[PDB]
Amino acid sequence: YPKKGLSPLALNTMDQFSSRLIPINYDQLKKLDAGKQIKLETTQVSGNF
Amino acid sequence: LVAAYPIVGVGMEKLIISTNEHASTDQGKTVSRATTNSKTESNTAGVSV
């Protein structure tokens, strides 16, 4: 999701009703500024049948 | 005899703090020029003996 020919999906919010873009304080900004990278994990997935 | 019963509890790994300050820097320059024109006029008397 999406298919093979389309661009990826964007996430930038954290509410239930989308507002309040994700913040980062000053030390994490200076660590991310100097070459480092974040890692993304998946904990669980809910769905339907 | 034994009961079906779930028991849970949570545990702290780390804690991260993030402050709130509003720093500010300013930088300025200035250039000025002035002229002056004036005129005086004086009188003198005197007596010696």
CSV table of C-alpha atoms in Angstrom, one decimal:
chain,number,residue,atom,x,y,z
A,1,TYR,CA,0.0,0.0,0.0
A,2,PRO,CA,0.2,2.0,-2.3
A,3,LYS,CA,0.8,-0.1,-5.4
A,4,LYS,CA,4.1,-0.7,-7.3
A,5,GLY,CA,4.0,2.5,-9.4
A,6,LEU,CA,3.1,5.2,-6.8
A,7,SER,CA,5.0,7.4,-4.4
A,8,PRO,CA,5.2,6.5,-0.7
A,9,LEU,CA,3.0,7.6,2.2
A,10,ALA,CA,3.5,10.6,4.5
A,11,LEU,CA,3.0,10.8,8.3
A,12,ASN,CA,3.5,14.0,10.2
A,13,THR,CA,0.8,14.2,12.9
A,14,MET,CA,0.1,12.7,16.3
A,15,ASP,CA,-3.4,13.5,17.4
A,16,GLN,CA,-6.6,11.7,16.8
A,17,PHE,CA,-7.9,14.7,14.8
A,18,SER,CA,-4.9,15.7,12.9
A,19,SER,CA,-2.9,18.6,14.3
A,20,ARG,CA,0.2,19.2,16.4
A,21,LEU,CA,3.1,18.2,14.1
A,22,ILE,CA,5.8,16.1,15.7
A,23,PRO,CA,8.3,18.1,17.8
A,24,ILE,CA,12.0,17.6,18.4
A,25,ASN,CA,14.0,19.5,21.1
A,26,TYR,CA,17.4,21.1,20.7
A,27,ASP,CA,19.8,18.2,21.6
A,28,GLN,CA,18.0,15.8,19.4
A,29,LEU,CA,18.1,18.4,16.6
A,30,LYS,CA,21.8,18.8,17.0
A,31,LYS,CA,22.3,15.0,17.0
A,32,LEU,CA,20.2,14.7,13.9
A,33,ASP,CA,22.0,17.6,12.3
A,34,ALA,CA,25.4,16.0,12.6
A,35,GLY,CA,24.9,13.0,10.3
A,36,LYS,CA,22.9,10.6,12.4
A,37,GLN,CA,19.7,8.8,11.5
A,38,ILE,CA,16.5,7.6,13.1
A,39,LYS,CA,15.2,4.0,13.1
A,40,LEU,CA,11.6,3.0,12.7
A,41,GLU,CA,10.0,0.0,14.3
A,42,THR,CA,6.5,-1.5,14.2
A,43,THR,CA,4.9,-2.8,17.4
A,44,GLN,CA,1.5,-4.1,16.4
A,45,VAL,CA,-1.1,-3.8,13.6
A,46,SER,CA,-4.9,-3.9,14.1
A,47,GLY,CA,-7.3,-4.6,11.2
A,48,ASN,CA,-10.5,-6.4,10.0
A,49,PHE,CA,-11.6,-9.6,8.3
B,1,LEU,CA,-10.1,-24.4,41.9
B,2,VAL,CA,-7.4,-22.1,40.5
B,3,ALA,CA,-8.7,-18.9,38.9
B,4,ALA,CA,-8.2,-17.4,35.4
B,5,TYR,CA,-6.6,-14.1,36.2
B,6,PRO,CA,-4.3,-11.7,34.5
B,7,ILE,CA,-1.8,-9.6,36.5
B,8,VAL,CA,0.2,-6.8,34.8
B,9,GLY,CA,2.4,-3.8,35.8
B,10,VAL,CA,4.7,-1.4,34.0
B,11,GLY,CA,8.4,-0.5,34.5
B,12,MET,CA,10.5,2.6,33.6
B,13,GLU,CA,13.4,2.3,31.2
B,14,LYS,CA,14.5,6.0,30.7
B,15,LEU,CA,13.2,9.5,31.1
B,16,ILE,CA,14.0,12.5,28.8
B,17,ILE,CA,13.5,16.1,29.7
B,18,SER,CA,13.3,19.1,27.4
B,19,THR,CA,13.5,22.7,28.5
B,20,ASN,CA,11.8,25.9,27.3
B,21,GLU,CA,13.8,29.0,26.5
B,22,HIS,CA,13.5,31.8,23.9
B,23,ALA,CA,16.9,32.9,22.9
B,24,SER,CA,17.5,35.8,20.6
B,25,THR,CA,20.3,37.6,18.8
B,26,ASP,CA,20.3,41.0,17.1
B,27,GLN,CA,22.9,42.9,15.0
B,28,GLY,CA,22.8,46.5,13.7
B,29,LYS,CA,24.7,49.2,11.9
B,30,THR,CA,24.4,53.0,11.7
B,31,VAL,CA,25.6,55.8,9.5
B,32,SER,CA,25.2,59.6,10.1
B,33,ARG,CA,26.2,63.0,8.9
B,34,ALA,CA,25.7,66.6,10.1
B,35,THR,CA,26.7,70.1,9.2
B,36,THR,CA,27.0,73.3,11.2
B,37,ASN,CA,27.1,77.0,10.2
B,38,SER,CA,27.4,79.9,12.7
B,39,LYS,CA,28.2,83.6,13.2
B,40,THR,CA,29.3,85.6,16.2
B,41,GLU,CA,29.8,89.4,16.8
B,42,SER,CA,31.3,91.1,19.8
B,43,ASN,CA,32.2,94.6,21.1
B,44,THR,CA,34.7,95.9,23.7
B,45,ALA,CA,35.4,99.1,25.6
B,46,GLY,CA,38.0,99.9,28.3
B,47,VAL,CA,39.8,102.6,30.2
B,48,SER,CA,43.3,102.5,31.8
B,49,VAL,CA,45.3,105.1,33.8
